[PDB]
Each structure stands twice: as structure tokens, then as C-alpha cells.
């Protein structure tokens, strides 16, 4: 799924190489990201995730990990 994810956005990045500043084709992209506002908010907030590693160091139990 994630693999596919890339490809999807990749086509979008293949859709934006030709842009002016306020090109139609790009502001339609913003228009969809805002049409899918919270819906995209979810994917971007999936990327809160190493990263949290230090918090494990805050209350590590037995070096392998475990909390």
C-alpha cells in the first residue's frame, strides 16, 4: 500500500514539473488537498513515526527494549 502511495504522489510530482506560479494544474492540486483536508491530515499525521526512541531511553527496562 505504502509502495503504491509513493507512486500516486509521484504521478502528482510528475504532474507539477511544468508549473508556472499560479498554474491551474497546481492550484487544483491545492484544491484537492483542501477538498481532502482532514483526510490528508490523517496521512500526514501518520508520519509522527526511531523518532520516539529517546522516550524508550526515558524508562528502559532491560536494554533489548520492553516497556
Partner 1 sequence: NFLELAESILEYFRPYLGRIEIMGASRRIERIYFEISETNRAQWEMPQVKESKRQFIFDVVNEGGEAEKMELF
How far apart, in whole angstroms, are the C-alpha atoms of residue 8 and residue 39? 15
> Using the rule CB under 8 A, is 7 a contact of partner 1?
no
Residues between 41 and 60 that touch partner 1 (CB under 8 A): 41, 44, 47-48
- Please say which residue, 48 or 54, places its beta carbon nearer to partner 1: 48
Stretch that binds partner 1, among 3-11, 17-25, 55-63 (CB under 8 A): 17-25
Within the chain, residue ranges assigned H as helices are: 2-15, 24-35, 37-46, 53-58
Helix axis angle for 24-35 and 37-46, nearest 10°, is: 80
Residues forming the site for partner 1 (CB under 8 A): 13, 17-20, 30, 33-34, 37, 40-41, 44, 47-48
Amino acid at each position: 500500500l505504502l509502495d503504491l502511495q509513493k507512486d500516486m504522489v509521484v504521478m502528482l510530482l510528475s504532474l507539477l514539473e511544468g508549473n508556472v506560479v499560479n498554474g491551474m494544474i497546481a492550484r487544483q492540486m491545492v484544491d484537492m488537498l483542501v477538498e481532502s483536508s482532514s483526510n490528508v491530515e490523517m496521512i500526514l499525521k501518520f508520519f509522527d513515526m526511531i523518532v520516539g526512541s529517546e522516550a524508550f531511553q526515558d524508562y528502559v527496562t532491560d536494554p533489548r527494549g520492553l516497556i
